[PDB]
Scaffold this active site. Structure first.
Site, mmCIF file in Angstrom:
data_model
loop_
_atom_site.group_PDB
_atom_site.id
_atom_site.type_symbol
_atom_site.label_atom_id
_atom_site.label_comp_id
_atom_site.label_asym_id
_atom_site.label_seq_id
_atom_site.Cartn_x
_atom_site.Cartn_y
_atom_site.Cartn_z
ATOM 1 N N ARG A 292 -22.080 16.393 -26.292
ATOM 2 C CA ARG A 292 -21.494 15.624 -25.161
ATOM 3 C C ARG A 292 -21.253 14.269 -25.468
ATOM 4 N NH1 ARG A 292 -26.046 18.010 -24.265
ATOM 5 N NH2 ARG A 292 -27.117 16.004 -24.930
ATOM 6 N N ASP B 50 -30.896 20.129 -29.235
ATOM 7 C CA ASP B 50 -30.270 19.825 -27.971
ATOM 8 C C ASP B 50 -30.076 21.094 -27.297
ATOM 9 O OD1 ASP B 50 -28.927 18.022 -26.457
ATOM 10 O OD2 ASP B 50 -26.999 19.024 -26.803
ATOM 11 N N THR B 51 -31.122 21.945 -26.968
ATOM 12 C CA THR B 51 -30.872 23.202 -26.329
ATOM 13 C C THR B 51 -32.167 23.017 -25.283
ATOM 14 O OG1 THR B 51 -32.222 24.295 -27.930
ATOM 15 C CG2 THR B 51 -29.779 24.333 -28.164
ATOM 16 N N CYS C 263 -28.316 34.329 -29.923
ATOM 17 C CA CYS C 263 -29.355 33.408 -30.436
ATOM 18 C C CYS C 263 -30.447 33.712 -30.956
ATOM 19 C CB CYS C 263 -29.691 32.540 -28.861
ATOM 20 S SG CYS C 263 -30.902 31.218 -29.343
ATOM 21 N N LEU C 264 -30.663 33.018 -32.215
ATOM 22 C CA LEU C 264 -31.451 33.242 -33.196
ATOM 23 C C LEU C 264 -32.914 32.327 -32.712
ATOM 24 C CD1 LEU C 264 -30.015 33.358 -36.496
ATOM 25 C CD2 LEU C 264 -31.077 35.091 -35.473
ATOM 26 N N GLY C 265 -32.863 31.630 -31.804
ATOM 27 C CA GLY C 265 -34.043 30.603 -31.403
ATOM 28 C C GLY C 265 -34.398 31.055 -30.169
HETATM 29 C C1 MNR Z 1 -33.721 25.699 -33.510
HETATM 30 C C2 MNR Z 1 -33.144 26.760 -33.228
HETATM 31 C C3 MNR Z 1 -32.621 27.152 -31.988
HETATM 32 C C4 MNR Z 1 -33.063 27.169 -30.563
HETATM 33 C C5 MNR Z 1 -34.367 26.414 -30.015
HETATM 34 C C6 MNR Z 1 -32.156 27.527 -29.832
HETATM 35 C C7 MNR Z 1 -31.967 27.643 -28.377
HETATM 36 C C8 MNR Z 1 -31.125 27.828 -27.709
HETATM 37 C C9 MNR Z 1 -31.244 27.804 -26.012
HETATM 38 C C10 MNR Z 1 -32.153 27.321 -25.450
HETATM 39 C C11 MNR Z 1 -32.497 27.248 -24.183
HETATM 40 C C12 MNR Z 1 -29.865 28.275 -25.672
HETATM 41 C C13 MNR Z 1 -29.845 28.460 -24.056
HETATM 42 C C14 MNR Z 1 -29.056 28.857 -26.568
HETATM 43 C C15 MNR Z 1 -27.963 29.562 -26.694
HETATM 44 C C16 MNR Z 1 -27.342 29.957 -27.797
HETATM 45 N N1 MNR Z 1 -27.795 30.067 -29.030
HETATM 46 MN MN1 MNR Z 1 -29.484 29.409 -29.742
HETATM 47 N N2 MNR Z 1 -29.962 28.488 -27.777
HETATM 48 N N3 MNR Z 1 -28.987 29.619 -31.554
HETATM 49 C C17 MNR Z 1 -29.352 29.033 -32.737
HETATM 50 C C18 MNR Z 1 -30.547 28.229 -33.085
HETATM 51 C C19 MNR Z 1 -31.368 27.864 -31.724
HETATM 52 N N4 MNR Z 1 -30.992 28.161 -30.579
HETATM 53 C C20 MNR Z 1 -28.549 29.584 -34.010
HETATM 54 C C21 MNR Z 1 -29.154 29.508 -35.421
HETATM 55 C C22 MNR Z 1 -27.538 30.317 -33.558
HETATM 56 C C23 MNR Z 1 -26.348 30.953 -34.215
HETATM 57 C C24 MNR Z 1 -26.576 32.502 -34.136
HETATM 58 C C25 MNR Z 1 -25.385 33.014 -35.087
HETATM 59 O O1 MNR Z 1 -24.233 32.390 -34.837
HETATM 60 O O2 MNR Z 1 -25.201 34.370 -35.407
HETATM 61 C C26 MNR Z 1 -27.857 30.514 -32.075
HETATM 62 C C27 MNR Z 1 -27.007 30.660 -31.252
HETATM 63 C C28 MNR Z 1 -26.772 30.541 -29.902
HETATM 64 C C29 MNR Z 1 -25.731 31.010 -29.065
HETATM 65 C C30 MNR Z 1 -24.504 31.760 -29.330
HETATM 66 C C31 MNR Z 1 -23.334 30.821 -29.532
HETATM 67 C C32 MNR Z 1 -21.935 31.543 -29.759
HETATM 68 O O3 MNR Z 1 -22.185 32.668 -29.725
HETATM 69 O O4 MNR Z 1 -20.956 30.699 -30.331
HETATM 70 C C33 MNR Z 1 -26.024 30.726 -27.744
HETATM 71 C C34 MNR Z 1 -25.397 30.638 -26.629
HETATM 72 C C1 LIG Z 2 -23.581 26.901 -28.672
HETATM 73 C C2 LIG Z 2 -24.767 26.249 -29.413
HETATM 74 C C3 LIG Z 2 -26.115 26.007 -28.218
HETATM 75 C C4 LIG Z 2 -25.211 27.345 -30.576
HETATM 76 C C5 LIG Z 2 -26.623 26.761 -31.100
HETATM 77 C C6 LIG Z 2 -26.358 25.254 -31.171
HETATM 78 C C7 LIG Z 2 -24.961 25.178 -30.408
HETATM 79 C C8 LIG Z 2 -24.370 23.664 -30.025
HETATM 80 C C9 LIG Z 2 -24.045 25.650 -31.633
HETATM 81 O O1 LIG Z 2 -23.025 25.191 -32.605
HETATM 82 C C10 LIG Z 2 -24.273 27.291 -31.660
#
Ligand code: MNR
Ligand SMILES: CC1(C)[C@@H]2CC[C@@]1(C)C(=O)C2
Ligand SMILES: [K+]
Length: 404
Positions: free
Chosen positions: A176, A241-242, A347-349
């Protein structure tokens, strides 16, 4: 606005600005929902932020995320300069090359790590909430939504908390941007921060997430310093930032709905289910893919190089996927959504995310069962790759609380 392409007709033109939607005042999810009205087609084209397609239905969003042969994650962000500059691992890679990196990432944020962090996640949530409890008020985004997930991430990554202001500023410009930094500049600044640290930890291998990634193996072979940097950067954005934003959306809702608070207070065993429903109703992510070539997708000719936004947020809000989508029902039989993505990039997290969400709900309602939006407050949201809440002032009667 950007000049309309040749292959792009005129009837499918819906000028939606993902970084500043028209009805943002009614709530960001509401703002994106306008793309799902009867008057709007499944797939439209917007001339905002450079021009790109936008799948507005869960059916096409899911289908595109599964077909990585046509929809490549090589350039996942909008605008194009951001997507081209975007080189995080594993997200900027398509299978099969992508798969190997996910396993390493899982080693630092997967369930096994969530299990180790269990005590600390629990401890921090309780400590933060108990400190706020007697105040009868707080600025949720600043007092809990940010410090809880971020401090847990910094702990896991072995980074000093004094670095949070700088790092959080940078991550926010990539999702953002306030205009002071382009995605490329924000990204290079994050890498600049990581480079010396990764080098330090490749020499004296530690237990932290950065050390584990930096000294890790990708399907049998050593990860390079560049690859470790690109993976670590993504992890930082995920941790900073998620969940941080989602928690505010969820608490805003609970603060506004006494009946829903009562439900979780009377039956805490429903919290996990409630979490899932809140993840659907308050989904907040929207990134995309790029066409690897000319392709006819749903009667709409897509040219090569074209960017297509596939809002993960919209799937679960699709009236076709869930009846009465804007309604929060903790007993909803089939909570359909793609909040954590779809396809090989799932998502891995999400395990760390769900634990942080569930713990927050359980521990907050345990100590501060009753709370409301500060009188006269108008909650303002923000849209982007990841949507958020600008501020969430909450109030409550200390006499209705209880210290554990
Ligand atoms: C510190 C770790 C992380 C946390 C906490 C977290 C929390 C969250 C969260 C919380 C409410 C939401 C909603 C969330 C949403 C996503 N998230 Mn998540 N996420 N998340 C990642 C790390 C994390 N996420 C990573 C690493 C990937 C990439 C996996 C891949 O590319 O194969 C991923 C991927 C993703 C994607 C795939 C994006 C794409 O397909 O281009 C989405 C949507
Ligand atoms: C779309 C996402 C939430 C996912 C994890 C962080 C993010 C901003 C990425 O660049 C991949
Ligand atoms: K790229």
């Amino acid at each position: 606005l950007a000049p309309l392409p040749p292959h792009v007709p005129e009837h499918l033109v819906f000028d939606f600005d993902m970084y500043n939607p028209s009805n943002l005042s009614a709530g960001v999810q509401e703002a994106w929902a306008v793309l799902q009205e009867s008057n709007v087609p499944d797939l439209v084209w917007t001339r905002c932020n450079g021009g790109h397609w936008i799948a507005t239905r869960g059916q096409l969003i899911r289908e595109a995320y599964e077909d990585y042969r046509h929809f490549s994650s090589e350039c996942p962000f909008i605008p194009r300069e951001a997507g081209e500059a975007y080189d995080f691992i594993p997200t900027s890679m398509d299978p099969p090359e992508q798969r190997q990196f996910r396993a390493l990432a899982n080693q630092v944020v997967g369930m096994p790590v969530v299990d180790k962090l269990e005590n600390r996640i629990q401890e921090l949530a309780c400590s933060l909430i108990e400190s706020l409890r007697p105040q009868g008020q707080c600025n949720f985004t600043e007092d809990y939504a940010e410090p809880f997930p971020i401090r847990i991430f910094m702990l896991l990554a072995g980074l000093p908390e004094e670095d949070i202001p700088h790092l959080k500023y940078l991550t926010d410009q990539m999702t953002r941007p306030d205009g002071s930094m382009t995605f490329a500049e924000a990204k290079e600044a994050l890498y600049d921060y990581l480079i010396p640290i990764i080098e330090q930890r490749r020499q004296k291998p530690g237990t932290d997430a950065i050390s584990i990634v930096a000294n890790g193996q990708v399907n049998g072979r050593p990860i390079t310093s560049d690859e470790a940097k690109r993976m670590c950067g993504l992890l930082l954005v995920g941790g900073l930032d998620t969940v941080v934003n989602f928690l505010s959306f969820s608490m805003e809702f609970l603060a506004k709905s006494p009946e829903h608070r009562q439900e979780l207070i009377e039956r805490p065993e429903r919290i996990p289910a409630a979490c899932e429903e809140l993840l659907r109703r308050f989904s907040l992510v929207a990134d995309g893919r790029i066409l690897t070539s000319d392709y006819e997708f749903h009667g709409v000719q897509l040219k090569k190089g074209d960017q297509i936004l596939l809002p993960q947020m919209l799937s679960g809000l699709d009236e076709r996927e869930n009846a009465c989508p804007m309604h929060v029902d903790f007993s909803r039989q089939k909570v359909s959504h793609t909040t954590f993505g779809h396809g090989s990039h799932l998502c891995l997290g999400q395990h760390l995310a769900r634990r942080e969400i569930i713990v927050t709900l359980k521990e907050w309602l345990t100590r501060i069962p009753d709370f409301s939006i500060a009188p006269g407050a108008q909650i303002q949201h923000k849209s982007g790759i990841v949507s958020g809440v600008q501020a969430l002032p909450l109030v409550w009667d200390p006499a209705t609380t209880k210290a554990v």
